[PDB]
């Protein structure tokens, strides 16, 4: 069919590459603005997160396949940096395009990007210093890396509640965060908030007085298949159809309700005694009034409507495991959370399972109905926790504000690898593409992305100074001392994913259709 | 019907689609490499090192777009390399010689030209083909690490240098001819999902995934016995063909189990007789095969007599109608080594077999699932030299330089040849020099004056031995540099290219039928 | 949504939405709203003097407006007045950021200027309160408070409905220790006079009132969406249309087939039996002879408000009523709430949270307007509960807001100065909004609100006196808001608005 060769094809490559990406540069630091992607369903959104607005719906490109691929690698693996990541991938194309403009081969430009990616990745370890798992040192790297995703405020309220969660870990070397992400919200008249809640907390439970309110030994039989069924881990069908079929189930329901409380009371008789130790049946469907009394009146805690999301954060936190039925779960297999406590504030009934034997879970309770409140904080929760988790798992974190970007291109200054142009052309485009992180903040704010930088550069060329563009006012500042430090796990995943895709496009010559 | 198409216009149609394929994968060829992008009508990214892969995935024209796949598939069947080279030689040469010659009015002396520019090509190639030793995996290395890097893999090359270099020596055609050059049957490439480089063992024999699949199947009887039917099983896996009628519901089930029961009663006889191994070539389904695991037997199923009978000679087994029946050993021990290295519980039987007919399955493990196919192509790219070096110790250092050694010496023989012959001779000899100068393109600088001096250097100093490399773009001794151009490769890559040339030069019409 | 381009949203959509959202606050708020014909997907003329109500009836295509409309509804939640007042301050200030974008200031900059200024304005408002009033058992005070809440969103009866809601919003709680989300549950019956609209308490079914009074004191209900036609789940209640031979059996049997019906109902106990379905001929004959009260043909809203007040379940399958099919009321006394003969229950102490205001008139537009009022009095009465606080009404307080934010803007230097310079005026859109419906001069009223510095006094409302600008005391006008009602609005006029410009363009294929 049609043949689009080289510059004709590589144009659509480079045009589609930096086509969205240049507008994607509206995000970095806190000062980078927020972009609203509305997916075809109509969801109004704000993420300064670089990758997020891509993967859902975007201007469809050939490169749209690659930009969704590499924008993933930053937040998928590390959990932070896509706001600072996606921007560099074609930032390295802008300079090379001008070098290719000399007739300089796509391959001689191909080999160049891989060259100094070493030097800067080498420099990331070179520039980083070991920074503590301490609350505030996290908070510092938080206050940085959180903002290297989203805007200050929600990151600034995620500069505390987050730092606790990644700290609250039993112990975890996971670069991202799983069970200590527990998404709850009470729709709240006031604008917004995120309520940090330790341990797993049930979205719904049933707290009735005859149960154990405060349960010091709480042995959890996780329960789903209702009092409406008998010895089953999945519910069967219903009869509403025939009038005589309507009288079959509700009359025989007495068989099903007690058959379960039979097990439930005796499993408390077995494990918990009666008034001595609290027993817990967490009933993830509704609870019928017979046993909802009888589960209670025996002393068992019957917790209605727990989510499977709770159920999984139930197990590892309590140390016991779950079940799908109201019938006997093994005393070992019974989940033991040294506190099963259901607190009810406003819209939702929250059951704390606490004194967790190994809590892997904490809970974040969001506030406010509005999606313009929620989508801002909701999208920063994932990127709030995992980011600072990159500060705790790695004592090594790279200083932010591009003070590392300025501190390489000055050392990377052209023809330190003097051998030729083509590898230099990469390390040249690469030294120049490094500087976007100071530039984009001084692009967001005033002076110039250059005027500040050329001062920053000079200010960094001034010895003993790691200096960077202010994350808000676009003005000089010292990234180390101010306490802005990017996650080194972000920072390594910064250079890898950016340089490879552009290089992947650089061996691309002819496109066919 | 009634339609007539003409000659040079059809020749041009043969020129057109091929001339497009002659470009990108020529750039993708050699140490200066590229990728061929393919735009899906939906926008999906596709880039490969093979344009025929791009062609299979997009519109293919009835002209040489169809054929340059075909003859490269012809090139893909034989040595398993140069498909990238064939597409870029044929359409090029057909674009080069024809117009210059047909304006002189002849395909005719061009008919003779391709085999004449083949003649010296084949001639001085073998003459400057440098002996490289078979006994040394190291003196087979520089040639095979060169061959596996013709497609630009040093990754599993050295590991393909380990396994395959001695494996083709262990490949025997049971005609007791070569052997040395081996088509892929007696030497196969078959892989194990996942694994690691040590889970890759040098494997010179057949590998049956079905020899030991499961632990209750045979475990390390170092010389098994593969029973094919005939007594321990029989020639019936049948159907009793029971009468049927609408009034009998049980009658539908009995005819369904009857296929298995005969498969069962043979395996029941296997339960009775209990070999270490049975090969069921009619095959045994899951039911009766689960009955062979309690009998301490492997069930080898739905493989072939050829492989089995070779496996028999390969693993030390043989065909005997019963285990209790014992006649004689055609192979007492036919194994070089017997291995089962499992990924997961599913077992994979590696029987290393030296100079057996076998399969010479050469165990090829990527670090994981995905790069297995790399190690396959590499161990396949391996066996190309492995059958080349073992056949021909002579192989030309070159492929930048061998392409020069051919080209410049060809027209250099027109100085000897002259006649009307020289004109189509050189013209079909013209296009060859450009291949390195096409790669010397992405060396930057001057792709022309380099080869120019190298063309002088050709007859001046040396040709393919001392010459241009795609890595250098400049003169190095391709031997001293370790870049080698297998002798079997050049005898083919040009041939099938010039095979399609005279043909598409001689196909002057396309009828409607 | 649609695929856009050119970063148009900010400089175009964001300014488009609010002003498109406007005029619902601007020519409708304060003393009077101006009507807007609304034809929903069901065609009838609808009167909206409230912004939320017309925003309810405005389907939002904008990504921008979809943010602000909801928070403009959330004030009808949180206040019930000033839901207009959301958008007037929202987009005006928001519009002022575009010329700040013309100044060149970054998007996040001027928004932060609005936050720190509204947080500052959040400090200004409670100082601007003039005294307070709360009596939650009394009509007079409450009506004087709620009247601005209805006045803004009502062009109709003000004090009269202020009194009737200050009746109702109170009287459903005979004394309010607090006020619920919604207590007053209106039985909507038009006709008679629009002042023939009355206030009673309990649940009213304006569908068929049938059976007969079995107990006028005990109202105990068996509530069903179920037909009593012989339809029931114990036996086959099939009506026989097959042949005249068949139907006579139903004539003989429905006395008995309603017998397994009323008794399975009334033997487990009941008095009223609420029928969302129907009752057959011989069923009704049997139900009239057994003298079980069956309120028939009831709507969900009939079935529901009951199930909302006593608590209950109206189910299409007939069965012995459980106490969640069995409610009890104060009384079932067949009586007219606003001049229509219907069953009217009574609920205050028993269950409560239901108060009938029959909303009458010539047309449902005369119902909808007085429906705005009583509802606008519902929500702000809960506002009256949460604080006794009374701010002088809209447009008098706005200068103390503007005046200080001006001087605050004068203390602003740093680039958001101009942005808080923008924040200062946007309160003076309130006299402007109340000027332009009046048709009078904003900046001169704004000046009439400056030079004299009556600062919580001078305002031009919406009057028959609005031919000429006359700044009148809102504190004495009977229009009095509250800092909370302010703060809720002053928060929710900002949040969605300050966050709507922070967006960038939609990116789609």
Swiss-Prot record, chain A:
ATP binds at residues 29, 81-83, 401-402, 486, 491. Component of the chaperonin-containing T-complex (TRiC), a hexadecamer composed of two identical back-to-back stacked rings enclosing a protein folding chamber. Each ring is made up of eight different subunits: TCP1/CCT1, CCT2, CCT3, CCT4, CCT5, CCT6A/CCT6, CCT7, CCT8. Interacts with PACRG. This is T-complex protein 1 subunit zeta. InterPro entries: Chap_CCT_zeta, Chaperone_TCP-1, Chaperonin_TCP-1_CS, Cpn60/GroEL/TCP-1, GroEL-like_apical_dom_sf, GROEL-like_equatorial_sf, TCP-1-like_intermed_sf, TCP-1_chaperonin. Its EC number is 3.6.1.-. There is a cross-link at residue 241 (Glycyl lysine isopeptide (Lys-Gly) (interchain with G-Cter in SUMO2)). Transmembrane segments: none annotated. It is found in: Cytoplasm. Keywords: Acetylation, ATP-binding, Chaperone, Cytoplasm, Hydrolase, Isopeptide bond, Nucleotide-binding, Phosphoprotein, Ubl conjugation. ADP binds at residues 29, 81-84, 148-149, 401, 486. Its main location: cytoplasm. Component of the chaperonin-containing T-complex (TRiC), a molecular chaperone complex that assists the folding of actin, tubulin and other proteins upon ATP hydrolysis. The TRiC complex mediates the folding of WRAP53/TCAB1, thereby regulating telomere maintenance. NCBIfam families: chap_CCT_zeta (TIGR02347), thermosome_beta (NF041083). PROSITE patterns: TCP1_1, TCP1_2, TCP1_3. It comes from Homo sapiens. One of its GO terms (biological process) is positive regulation of telomerase RNA localization to Cajal body. Belongs to the TCP-1 chaperonin family. The modification N6-acetyllysine is found at residues 189, 277, 355, 367, 378. The modification Phosphoserine is found at residue 195. GO terms for molecular function: ATP binding; ATP hydrolysis activity; ATP-dependent protein folding chaperone; protein folding chaperone; RNA binding; unfolded protein binding; WD40-repeat domain binding. The keyword Chaperone applies.
From Swiss-Prot, chain B:
One of its GO terms (cellular component) is extracellular exosome. The keyword Disulfide bond applies. ATP binds at residues 30, 82-84, 399, 470, 485. Gene3D superfamilies: GroEL, GroEL-like equatorial domain, TCP-1-like chaperonin intermediate domain. The modification N6-acetyllysine is found at residue 210. ADP binds at residues 30, 82-85, 150-151, 399, 470-471, 485, 490. InterPro entries: Chap_CCT_gamma, Chaperone_TCP-1, Chaperonin_TCP-1_CS, Cpn60/GroEL/TCP-1, GroEL-like_apical_dom_sf, GROEL-like_equatorial_sf, TCP-1-like_intermed_sf, TCP-1_chaperonin. Disulfide bonds join 354-360. It catalyses: ATP + H2O = ADP + phosphate + H(+). Its EC number is 3.6.1.-. One of its GO terms (molecular function) is ATP-dependent protein folding chaperone. SUPFAM superfamilies: GroEL apical domain-like, GroEL equatorial domain-like, GroEL-intermediate domain like. GO terms for biological process: binding of sperm to zona pellucida; chaperone mediated protein folding independent of cofactor; chaperone-mediated protein folding; positive regulation of protein localization to Cajal body; positive regulation of telomerase RNA localization to Cajal body; positive regulation of telomere maintenance via telomerase; protein folding; protein stabilization. The modification Phosphoserine is found at residues 158, 231-232, 240. There is a cross-link at residues 3, 236-237, 369 (Glycyl lysine isopeptide (Lys-Gly) (interchain with G-Cter in SUMO2)). Mg(2+) binds at residue 81. It is found in: Cytoplasm. It holds the Pfam family Cpn60_TCP1. The modification Phosphotyrosine is found at residue 235. Component of the chaperonin-containing T-complex (TRiC), a molecular chaperone complex that assists the folding of actin, tubulin and other proteins upon ATP hydrolysis. The TRiC complex mediates the folding of WRAP53/TCAB1, thereby regulating telomere maintenance. As part of the TRiC complex may play a role in the assembly of BBSome, a complex involved in ciliogenesis regulating transports vesicles to the cilia. Belongs to the TCP-1 chaperonin family. NCBIfam families: chap_CCT_gamma (TIGR02344), thermosome_alpha (NF041082), thermosome_beta (NF041083). This is T-complex protein 1 subunit gamma.
Swiss-Prot record, chain C:
Disulfide bonds: none annotated. Its main location: cytoplasm. GO terms for molecular function: ATP binding; ATP hydrolysis activity; ATP-dependent protein folding chaperone; cadherin binding; protein folding chaperone; unfolded protein binding. Keywords: Acetylation, ATP-binding, Cell projection, Chaperone, Cilium, Cytoplasm, Cytoskeleton, Hydrolase, Isopeptide bond, Nucleotide-binding, Phosphoprotein, Ubl conjugation. Mg(2+) binds at residue 81. One of its GO terms (cellular component) is cytoplasm. ADP binds at residues 29-30, 82-85, 151-153, 394, 481. The keyword Chaperone applies. The modification Phosphotyrosine is found at residues 12, 487. The keyword Nucleotide-binding applies. There is a cross-link at residues 206, 236, 242 (Glycyl lysine isopeptide (Lys-Gly) (interchain with G-Cter in SUMO2)). Component of the chaperonin-containing T-complex (TRiC), a molecular chaperone complex that assists the folding of actin, tubulin and other proteins upon ATP hydrolysis. The TRiC complex mediates the folding of WRAP53/TCAB1, thereby regulating telomere maintenance. As part of the TRiC complex may play a role in the assembly of BBSome, a complex involved in ciliogenesis regulating transports vesicles to the cilia. Component of the chaperonin-containing T-complex (TRiC), a hexadecamer composed of two identical back-to-back stacked rings enclosing a protein folding chamber. Each ring is made up of eight different subunits: TCP1/CCT1, CCT2, CCT3, CCT4, CCT5, CCT6A/CCT6, CCT7, CCT8. Interacts with PACRG. Interacts with DNAAF4. Interacts with synaptic plasticity regulator PANTS. This is T-complex protein 1 subunit theta.
């Amino acid at each position: 069919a049609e043949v689009a060769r080289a510059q004709a094809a590589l144009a659509v490559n480079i045009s589609a590459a930096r086509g969205l990406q240049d507008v994607l540069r509206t995000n970095l630091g806190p000062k980078g603005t927020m972009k609203m992607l509305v997916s075809g369903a109509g969801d109004i959104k704000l993420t300064k997160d670089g990758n997020v607005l891509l993967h859902e719906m975007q201007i469809q490109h050939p490169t749209a396949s690659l930009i969704a691929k590499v924008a993933t690698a930053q937040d998928d693996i590390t959990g932070d940096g896509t706001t600072s990541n996606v921007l560099i991938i074609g930032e390295l194309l802008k300079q090379a395009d001008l070098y290719i403009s000399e007739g300089l081969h796509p391959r001689i430009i191909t080999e160049g990007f891989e060259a100094a990616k070493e030097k800067a990745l080498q420099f990331l370890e070179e520039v980083k210093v070991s920074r503590e798992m301490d609350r505030e040192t996290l908070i510092d790297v938080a206050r940085t890396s959180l903002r290297t995703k989203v805007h200050a405020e929600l990151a600034d309220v995620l500069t505390e509640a987050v730092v606790d969660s990644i700290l609250a870990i039993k112990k975890q070397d996971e670069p991202i965060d799983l069970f200590m992400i527990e998404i709850m919200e009470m729709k709240h008249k006031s604008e917004t908030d995120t309520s940090l809640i330790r341990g797993l907390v049930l979205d719904h439970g049933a707290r009735h007085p005859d149960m154990k309110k405060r349960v010091e030994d709480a042995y959890i039989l996780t329960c789903n298949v209702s009092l409406e069924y008998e010895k089953t881990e999945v519910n069967s069908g219903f009869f509403y159809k025939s009038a005589e079929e309507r009288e079959k189930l509700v009359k025989a329901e007495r068989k099903f309700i007690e058959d379960r409380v039979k097990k439930i009371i005796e499993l408390k008789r077995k494990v918990c005694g009666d008034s001595d130790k609290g027993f817990v049946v967490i009933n993830q469907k509704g609870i019928d009034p017979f046993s909802l009394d009888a589960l209670s009146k025996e002393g068992i805690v019957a917790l209605r409507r727990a989510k499977r999301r709770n159920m999984e954060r139930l197990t590892l936190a309590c140390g016991g495991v779950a079940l799908n039925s109201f019938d006997d779960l093994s005393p070992d297999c019974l989940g033991h959370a040294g506190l099963v406590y259901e607190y009810t504030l406003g819209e939702e009934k929250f059951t704390f399972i606490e004194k967790c034997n190994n809590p892997r879970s904490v809970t974040l309770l969001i506030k406010g109905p509005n999606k313009h409140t929620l989508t801002q904080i909701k999208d920063a929760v994932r990127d709030g926790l995992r980011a600072v988790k990159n500060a705790i798992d790695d004592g090594c974190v790279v200083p932010g504000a591009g003070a590392v970007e300025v501190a390489m291109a000055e050392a990377l200054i052209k023809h330190k690898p003097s051998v030729k142009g083509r590898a230099q052309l990469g390390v040249q485009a690469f030294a120049d593409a490094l500087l976007i992180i100071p530039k984009v903040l001084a692009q967001n704010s005033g002076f110039d992305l250059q005027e500040t930088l050329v001062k920053i550069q000079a200010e960094h060329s001034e010895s003993g100074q790691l200096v960077g563009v202010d994350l808000n006012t676009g003005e000089p500042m010292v990234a180390a001392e101010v306490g802005v430090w990017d996650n080194y796990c972000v920072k390594k995943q910064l250079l890898h994913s950016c340089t490879v895709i552009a290089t992947n496009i650089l061996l691309v010559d002819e496109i066919m259709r | 019907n009634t339609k007539r198409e003409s000659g040079r216009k059809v020749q041009s149609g043969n020129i057109n689609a091929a001339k497009t394929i002659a470009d990108i994968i020529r750039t993708c060829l050699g140490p200066k490499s590229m990728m061929k992008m393919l735009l899906d009508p939906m926008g999906g990214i596709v880039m490969t090192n093979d344009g025929n892969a791009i062609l299979r995935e997009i519109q293919v024209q009835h002209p040489a777009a169809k054929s340059m796949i075909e003859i490269s598939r012809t090139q893909d069947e034989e040595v398993g390399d140069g498909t990238t080279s064939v597409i870029i030689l044929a359409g090029e040469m057909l674009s080069v010689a024809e117009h210059f010659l047909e304006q002189q009015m002849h395909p005719t002396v061009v008919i003779s030209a391709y085999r004449k520019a083949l003649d010296d090509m084949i001639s001085t190639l073998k003459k400057i083909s440098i002996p490289v030793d078979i006994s040394d995996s190291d003196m087979m290395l520089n040639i095979i690490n060169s061959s596996i890097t013709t497609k630009a893999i040093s990754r599993w090359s050295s590991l393909a240098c380990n396994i395959a270099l001695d494996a083709v020596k262990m490949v025997q055609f049971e005609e007791n001819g070569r052997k040395e050059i081996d088509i892929k049957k007696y030497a196969r490439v078959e892989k194990i999902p996942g694994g690691i480089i040590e889970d890759s063992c040098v494997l010179r024999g057949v590998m049956i995934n079905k020899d030991v699949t499961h632990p209750r199947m045979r475990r390390y009887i170092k010389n098994p016995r593969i029973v094919l039917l005939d007594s321990s099983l029989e020639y019936k896996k049948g159907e009793s063909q029971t009468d049927i009628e609408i009034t009998r519901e049980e009658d539908f089930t009995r005819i369904l189990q009857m296929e298995e029961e005969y498969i069962q009663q043979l395996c029941e006889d296997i339960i009775q007789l209990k070999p270490d191994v049975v090969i069921t070539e009619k095959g045994i389904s899951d039911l009766a095969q689960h009955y062979l695991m309690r009998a301490n037997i492997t069930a080898i199923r739905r493989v072939r007599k050829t492989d089995n009978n070779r496996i028999a000679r390969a693993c030390g087994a043989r065909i005997v109608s019963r285990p209790e029946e014992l006649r004689e050993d055609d192979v007492g021990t036919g194994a070089g080594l017997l291995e089962i290295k499992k990924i997961g519980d599913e077992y994979f039987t590696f029987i290393t077999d030296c100079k057996d007919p076998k399969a010479c399955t050469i165990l090829l493990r990527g670090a994981s699932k995905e790069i297995l196919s790399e190690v396959e192509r590499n161990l396949q790219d391996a066996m190309q030299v492995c059958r080349n070096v073992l056949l021909d110790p002579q192989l030309v250092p070159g492929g930048g330089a061998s392409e020069m050694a051919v080209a410049h010496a060809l027209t250099e023989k027109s100085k000897a040849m002259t006649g009307v012959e020289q004109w189509p001779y050189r013209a079909v000899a013209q296009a060859l020099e450009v291949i390195p100068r096409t790669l010397i393109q992405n060396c930057g600088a001057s792709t022309i004056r380099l080869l120019t001096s190298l063309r002088a250097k050709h007859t001046q100093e040396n040709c393919e031995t001392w010459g241009v490399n795609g890595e250098t773009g400049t003169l190095v001794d391709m031997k001293e540099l370790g870049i080698w151009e297998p002798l079997a490769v050049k005898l083919q890559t040009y041939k099938t290219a010039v095979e399609t040339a005279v043909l598409l030069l001689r196909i002057d019409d396309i009828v409607s039928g | 949504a649609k695929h856009f381009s050119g970063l148009e949203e900010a400089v175009y959509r964001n300014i488009q939405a609010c002003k498109e959202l406007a005029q619902t606050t601007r020519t409708a708020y304060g003393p009077n709203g101006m009507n807007k014909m609304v034809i929903n997907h069901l065609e009838k003329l609808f009167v909206t003097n409230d912004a939320a109500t017309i925003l309810r009836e405005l389907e939002v295509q904008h990504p921008a407006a979809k943010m602000i409309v909801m928070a403009s509804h959330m004030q009808e939640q949180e206040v019930g007045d000033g839901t207009n007042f959301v958008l007037v301050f929202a987009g005006a200030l928001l519009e002022l950021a575009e010329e700040l974008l013309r100044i060149g200031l970054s998007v996040s900059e001027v928004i932060e200027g609005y936050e720190i200024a509204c947080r500052k304005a959040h400090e200004i408002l409670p100082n601007l309160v003039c005294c307070s009033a709360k009596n939650l058992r009394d009509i007079d005070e409450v009506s004087s408070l709620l009247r601005t809440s209805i006045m803004s969103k009502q062009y109709g009866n003000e004090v009269f409905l202020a009194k009737l809601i200050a009746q109702a919003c109170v009287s459903i709680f005979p004394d309010s220790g607090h006020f619920n989300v919604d207590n007053i549950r209106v039985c909507k019956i038009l006709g008679s006079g629009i002042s023939s609209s009355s206030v009673l308490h309990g649940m009213v079914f304006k569908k068929e009132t049938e059976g007969d009074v079995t107990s006028v004191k005990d109202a105990k209900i068996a509530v069903y969406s179920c037909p009593f036609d012989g339809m029931i789940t114990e036996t086959k209640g099939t009506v026989l249309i097959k042949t005249a031979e068949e139907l006579m059996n139903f004539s003989k049997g429905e006395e008995n087939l309603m017998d397994a019906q009323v008794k399975a109902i009334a033997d487990t106990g009941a008095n009223v039996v609420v029928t969302g379905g129907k009752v057959a001929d011989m069923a009704l004959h049997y139900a009239n002879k057994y003298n079980i009260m069956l309120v028939r043909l009831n709507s969900k809203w009939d079935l529901r408000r009951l199930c909302k007040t006593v608590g209950a379940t109206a189910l299409p399958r007939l069965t012995p009523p459980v106490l969640e099919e069995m409610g009890h009321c104060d009384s079932v006394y067949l009586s007219e709430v606003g001049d229509t003969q219907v069953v009217v229950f009574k609920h205050e102490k028993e269950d409560g949270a239901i108060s009938t205001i029959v909303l009458r008139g010539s047309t449902d537009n005369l119902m909808d307007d007085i429906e705005r009022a009583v509802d606008d009095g519902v929500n702000t009465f809960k506002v009256l509960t949460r604080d006794k606080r009374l701010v002088p009404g809209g447009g008098a307080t706005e200068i103390e807001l503007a005046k200080q934010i001006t001087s605050y803007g004068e203390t602003c230097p740093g680039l958001e100065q101009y942005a808080i310079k923008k924040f200062a005026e946007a309160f003076e859109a309130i006299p402007r909004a109340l000027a332009e419906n009046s048709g009078v001069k904003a900046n001169e009223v704004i000046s009439k609100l400056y030079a004299v510095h009556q600062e919580g006094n001078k305002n031009v409302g919406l009057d028959i006196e609005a031919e000429v600008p006359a700044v009148k005391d809102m504190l004495e006008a009977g229009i009095l808001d509250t800092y909370l009602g302010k703060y809720w609005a002053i928060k929710l006029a900002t949040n969605a608005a300050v966050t709507v410009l922070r967006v960038d363009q939609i990116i789609m294929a």
